[PDB]
Symmetry: C3
Subunit: 140 residues, 3 copies
């Protein structure tokens, strides 16, 4: 299912030196996000750093949201994941997309400019209206 | 996309002293969940605590689920995330919604009664039926 | 909402000694994935291990993806979660489904053959086409 989403380039390297996010195949669920940095950032074990993307999106449709996730290789092999675990991008958010990068492992890691460091999916969302009722199934 | 969801208030402070979850804007994807606690809980670095919400929902429609996520500020700045990372709420679950709060950082944190400590989204889900076949593309 | 999904059994114990993933109730959102192991794996605090499932799926429809999540009990009580936090399975992926199991806690844990160690949901996804525009709201 396809949707055009407005994007504003905030740093002129995005779409040039730092490619815009794209889908690798017709069947990819996520777009890889790249680090928009002037120089490498060394991220020590246990630490968190805020990585800019150099871009803003405006999903606009309240029936859609995005979710930011780690990439599986980085997470599994390097312990490079997100400090907020999973990021939620609201339809009315128009600020820069930021990546909270957390080193959950034991090895120092260099975040390089332009590196595909996380990924983002677009999922339909439903807005709940609560209906209060009196009455209406944590080894494993 | 909108859906009415049945909710049962389990603690009489919910909807009073502890506001019911709400969406901030017409374009918000998630509802913030509040800690239903009698007193603050001090959460040491690395530790996990189970926080009640004082409410139960019944999604009821098997085409919908909810996902509990950290809030980005708390996760990035304070290391206050979920012990199960992301929570999945099944359509037929009718128990109290519980929040596994994990301090993944290095600083002690006080969880206050009524604090917006996590968030929840409602997403469509598909139930898979497996079709066995003989035959039917882990730096980065 | 229901969909038949092609699955290939890669290890002949899957569907026999190691049951195929199933939904517990008509209202369950997720399928539990089992560890396809010859012997138990002892996972020390802080460590990550790659657990095979013995199966491959082919979602095939680019409007669908799967997400792998921790189980709430394991995550909250035992600190047994995913090293990549949340796994994203693309529609065109046809390899073995792998589980990055991370012990985020302080206690050693034994991963047993056949153990339900994670869960997976199928969610609709939308593929974004970016539309560049000049112009188009991080306690808490
Ligand atoms: O937990 C996971 C996550 C992914 N996978 C598989 C399926 C998915 O389609 C594939 C790629 O996932 P990612 O894009 O998150 N990983 P990465 O970007 O490191 O690999 P690639 O370069 O192939 O895209 O790996 C798993 O088996 N388990
Ligand atoms: O990983 C993320 C997560 C969120 N965001 C942006 C977009 C999202 O719409 C916005 C708010 O996300 P949260 O509601 O999770 N954070 P918080 O509740 O701390 O901020 P706010 O008070 O504005 O809602 O922050 C990112 O740029 N990266
Ligand atoms: O963060 C959470 C996650 C789950 N839950 C509730 C709702 C959900 O439907 C239920 C079961 O979730 P899981 O299947 O992830 N946990 P587990 O597999 O350990 O429990 P069960 O054996 O009942 O399925 O627990 C919460 O209250 N908070
Ligand atoms: Mg990838
Ligand atoms: Mg928020
Ligand atoms: Mg379960």
């Amino acid at each position: 299912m396809m949707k055009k989403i407005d994007v504003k380039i905030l740093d002129p390297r995005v779409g040039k030196e730092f490619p815009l996010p794209t889908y690798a195949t017709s069947g990819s669920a996520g777009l890889d996000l790249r680090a928009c940095l002037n120089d490498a950032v060394e991220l020590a074990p246990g630490d968190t750093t805020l990585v800019p993307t150099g871009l803003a999106i405006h999903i606009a449709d309240p029936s859609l949201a995005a979710m930011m996730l780690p990439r599986s290789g980085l997470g599994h092999k390097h312990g490079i994941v997100l400090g907020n675990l999973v990021g939620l991008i609201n339809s009315d958010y128009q600020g820069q997309l930021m990546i909270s990068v957390w080193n959950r492992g034991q090895d120092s890691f260099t975040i390089q400019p332009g590196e595909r460091i996380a990924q983002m999916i677009f999922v339909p969302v439903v807005q709940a209206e609560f209906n209060l009722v009196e009455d209406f199934r944590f080894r494993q």
